[PDB]
């Protein structure tokens, strides 16, 4: 129907955040401390609250480990604390609200600026606060061209401190809790203008909410030796002593700042490269012990079942075979060291899905660095020849720099047959020989083919009907050429 | 008379029958996931009678299944204007007495919605009809399965319990042992 | 740096079927690929007037000879040419822009002959 | 939807290769199987059998965000060449 | 993974009956790598606009 079409980051939806609440602060200790054991406790680091161990009742998801999407829960602490980011904002923009009046930003005006703001794209409303960056609280209260000047308040850059005196300005400063202002008046004055998205009020650092435990792994040693986790925002549970309760707000926000604010790989392989020219230009070949690398869909089809069962009976230690085959009932069964299997009811036991080895393309991809062209990874065939090199028709070493120091090379494995057919017949025969970046062939006699063929062409060389021998590696030759 | 409902849901046509017969297969697909308990309000294991149109029958970007949607008509049993039927007493309970009509399964009936003197005798879990007519204490002892000509008002879908309530005590007829 | 930055900055380019490129909001970047509409994929020998002469050199339809000074016969073939790609048109603007220069090229071929 | 005039008498190679891919999935789930059902009879080469289609009775519909639905039957136009 | 998540009373949870919010009208089942979900989580602490919506693949 519809997958993602327009998505951005995620946050705390407070409702679904807090129905999954189990415990905020059970006691002074956690991790089943006082039990002198560790059955499963205490109700927040366990069950779930975010599925960070082998199994427990996953909340709104299930089951372990993945597909238990991060579970939420109210772990509120209610430690007095405020907006550190808006601490800095208030310090910088110097009381942008014009506290404690919060009068209308503009007056009449000139509605030209009004309609210009209302009929322009976003990322622009900062100009209103820029206009009132300085004039805020130093102006005529209830006047034209703005409504600020109330009430003589400018903020001081005393670090994270926001000291708001009834400034002249520059003539009313004090040093030790006098001439201060509380962020609660800022909160009330909320209660650049857009509360649809830009709400500083709800970001108050008093109803702090936690990301789920899917961020944090805990390496329980099965030995009770080290269970470190990172970071995380729940750690302030140990401050229950101060949880009972202007410079005090600065101290609280300083304590907060400690722990509040600041297509890779699939189905791969890498070995060394030393090729053959016996591999027809489209074909390539891999090692043999890449067939020991598996767990392929190759979903069974009706015309295929018998040809699949032929290799299904082989198992773990035969090249043309099968292993770990995905069963009909979503419970895949192995033919590896626990195999002792392959009775294989001939139409149903894997009637959905099978998984074989590299028999014939079955395309594979080859990696290079740096990938100068898009023709440094191309589509080409298989089957299969041993001696774990990266062998391929040596006329196409140019767009790979398949350098021959013996420095290794990377192989892919694509296990999805949707655009695999599309890939194999679009960038397999037209990608190689013709580039749009230059218009010049990449495939070419790299070396001695050049001089060997040259020497053939040299007006000297006269041959024998007995030298129909060398003819016959070419046009009386390997697969797909034996006409006369 | 039974209400046809326009419905729009995902249709997952398997590739097994991409070229085979369509219309009846489409109907089977529609009946696939319109089951009794919980699909939507109002919907419970029901079907269609006429076509309207068949919209975009996508496959996928490149994946297996299909992306057909629904334009059809769904034969629901909406709770109508108290349509007169026969309501068989489905069960018994101290809170209320269960009834069966034909729309849903569970039909709660409060005590006073029984005959006004007829109470639930929890000493025997029998809603004995204290049929206090003709001045007589004629206790019409009828357990689960009491014959009552029910007509119901409402239907429910969301709560932890398909529960109904058919309003009884007809002023024009009375005699809830029959009506 | 510059390779990854060029790749990171220049992905949205597309080639939708109106012969015109479009952008994240479908804003026109081009209308043709330079009149020709061509791109360097099929850059055959010199495009495509000298190598193809050799291509048809190598498959010899023997019956013909110089009797009528075929230059005029070449002009008649230019006429059947003028007819045979005025059925040109499709996704177009790629043949009329060069059809007359084609004609001029065969005309100079006839003059050389 | 007769807005089919602004395509060369050829489908593009990208569209053709991807329709071959989706026909691969088709003939790889159970069967839409075609003119020869399994006359080409081989083991697990899923893709390389419906490549030999050369009829392809299916429709594909190509667009532009500021344009309508330029539709095309596979039959009614020329092939990869 | 086609996990279920949306903006209208929905989050990273079940599909058929979301114990987060089983409104029954907000089932999405969207393909997404777990990296974006980790971004969701780690940015829950560091507040930022959480835009979430869908659109029709069809006409």
């Amino acid at each position: 129907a519809k997958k993602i079409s327009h998505i951005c980051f995620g946050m705390k939806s407070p409702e679904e955040m807090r129905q999954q609440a189990h415990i905020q602060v059970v006691s002074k200790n956690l991790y089943s401390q006082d039990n002198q054991h560790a059955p499963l406790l205490y109700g927040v680091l366990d069950h779930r609250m975010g599925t960070s161990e082998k199994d427990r009742p996953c909340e709104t998801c299930g089951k372990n480990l993945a597909d238990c999407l991060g579970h939420y829960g109210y772990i509120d602490l209610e430690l007095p604390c405020f907006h550190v980011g808006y601490f800095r904002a208030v310090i910088g923009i110097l009381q942008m609200i014009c506290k404690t009046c919060c009068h209308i930003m503009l007056s009449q005006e000139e509605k030209k600026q009004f309609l210009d703001y209302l009929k322009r794209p976003g990322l622009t409303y900062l100009q209103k606060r820029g206009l009132k960056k300085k004039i805020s609280d130093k102006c005529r209260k209830k006047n034209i061209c703005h409504h600020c000047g109330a009430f003589n308040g400018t903020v001081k850059k005393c670090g994270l401190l926001k000291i708001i005196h009834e400034k002249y300005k520059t003539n009313k400063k004090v040093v030790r809790a006098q001439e201060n202002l509380n962020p609660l008046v800022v909160l009330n004055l909320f209660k650049l203008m857009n509360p649809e998205a830009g709400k500083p009020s709800d970001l108050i650092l008093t109803r702090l909410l936690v990301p789920p435990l899917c961020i944090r792994p805990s390496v329980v040693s099965d030995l009770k030796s080290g269970t470190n986790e990172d970071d995380l925002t729940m750690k302030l549970t140990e401050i229950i002593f101060l949880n009972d309760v202007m410079e005090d707000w600065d101290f609280l926000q300083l304590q907060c700042a400690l722990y509040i604010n600041s297509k890779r790989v699939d189905f791969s392989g890498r070995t060394v490269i030393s090729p053959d020219p016996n591999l027809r230009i489209d074909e390539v070949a891999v090692p043999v012990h890449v067939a020991k690398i598996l767990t392929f869909p190759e979903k069974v089809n009706k015309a295929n079942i018998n040809f699949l069962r032929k290799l299904v009976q082989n198992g773990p230690e035969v090249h043309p075979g099968a292993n770990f085959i995905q069963q009909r009932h979503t419970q895949m069964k192995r033919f590896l060291k626990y195999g002792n299997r392959e009775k294989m009811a001939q139409e149903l036991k894997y009637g959905d899905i099978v998984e074989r080895h590299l028999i014939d393309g079955d395309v594979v991809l080859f990696n290079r660095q740096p990938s100068l062209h898009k023709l440094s990874i191309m589509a080409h065939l298989a089957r299969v020849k041993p001696h774990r090199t990266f062998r391929f028709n040596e006329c196409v070493c140019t767009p790979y720099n398949a350098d021959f120091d013996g420095d290794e090379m990377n192989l892919h494995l694509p296990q999805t047959e949707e655009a695999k057919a599309e890939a194999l017949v679009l960038m397999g025969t037209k990608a190689n020989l013709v580039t749009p970046r230059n218009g010049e062939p990449l495939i070419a006699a790299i070396q001695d083919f050049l001089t060997g063929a040259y020497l053939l062409t040299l007006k000297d060389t006269f041959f024998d009907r007995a030298k129909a021998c060398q003819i016959i590696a070419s046009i009386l030759v390997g697969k797909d050429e034996k006409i006369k | 008379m039974f209400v046809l409902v326009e419905m729009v849901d995902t249709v997952r046509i398997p590739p097994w029958q991409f070229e085979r017969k369509l219309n009846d297969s489409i109907a089977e697909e529609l009946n696939k996931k319109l089951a009794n308990k919980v699909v939507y309000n109002v919907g419970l294991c029901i079907c269609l009678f006429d076509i309207t149109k068949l919209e975009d029958a996508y496959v996928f970007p490149g994946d297996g299944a299909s992306h057909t949607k629904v334009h059809f008509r769904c034969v629901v049993f909406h709770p109508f204007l108290d349509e007169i039927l026969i309501g068989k007493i489905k069960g018994c309970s101290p809170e209320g007495v269960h009834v069966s009509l034909g729309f849903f399964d569970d039909i709660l009936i409060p005590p006073e919605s029984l005959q006004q003197p007829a109470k639930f005798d929890e000493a025997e879990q029998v809603w004995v009809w204290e049929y206090e007519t003709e001045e007589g204490a004629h206790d019409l002892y009828m357990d689960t399965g009491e014959e009552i000509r029910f007509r119901v008002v409402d239907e429910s879908f969301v709560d932890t319990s398909y529960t109904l309530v058919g309003s009884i005590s007809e002023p024009g007829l009375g005699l809830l042992s029959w009506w | 740096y510059m390779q990854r930055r060029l790749v990171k900055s220049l992905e949205d380019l597309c080639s939708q079927y109106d012969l015109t490129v479009r952008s994240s909001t479908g804003d026109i970047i081009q209308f043709i690929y330079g009149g020709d509409g061509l791109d360097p994929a099929a850059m055959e020998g010199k495009l495509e007037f000298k190598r193809v002469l050799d291509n048809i050199k190598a498959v010899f339809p023997c019956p013909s000879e110089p009797a009528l000074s075929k230059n005029e016969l070449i002009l008649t073939t230019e006429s059947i040419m003028k007819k045979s790609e005025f059925l040109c048109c499709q996704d177009s603007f790629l043949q009329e822009i060069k059809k007359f220069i084609k004609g001029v090229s065969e005309k100079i071929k006839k003059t050389r002959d | 939807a007769n807005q089919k005039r602004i395509t060369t008498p050829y489908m593009t190679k990208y569209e053709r290769a991807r329709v071959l891919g989706t026909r691969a999935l088709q003939i790889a789930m159970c069967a839409p199987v075609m003119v020869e059902l399994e006359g080409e009879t081989d083991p697990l080469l899923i893709a390389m059998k419906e490549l030999k289609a050369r009829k392809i009775p299916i429709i594909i519909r190509r667009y532009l965000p500021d344009g309508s639905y330029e539709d095309w039957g596979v039959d009614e136009l020329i092939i990869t060449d | 993974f086609e996990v279920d998540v949306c903006g209208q009373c929905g989050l990273l949870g079940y599909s058929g009956w979301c114990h987060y919010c089983k409104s029954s009208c907000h089932v999405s089942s969207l393909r997404i790598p777990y990296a974006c979900k980790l971004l969701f989580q780690e940015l829950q602490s560091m507040n930022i606009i959480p835009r979430l919506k869908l659109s029709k693949y069809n006409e």
């Binding site: - | 996508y58 | 079927y17 994240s24 | 569209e15 667009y63 | 393909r31 790598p33």
Partner: peptide
Amino acid sequence: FGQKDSVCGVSECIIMGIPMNIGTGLFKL
């Protein structure tokens, strides 16, 4: 400050795992 981010092009698509939609990936029958 509640300001949006401009990482919403198409290079994010590979980290975000969604189908591309331009030229031919915008199918609307």
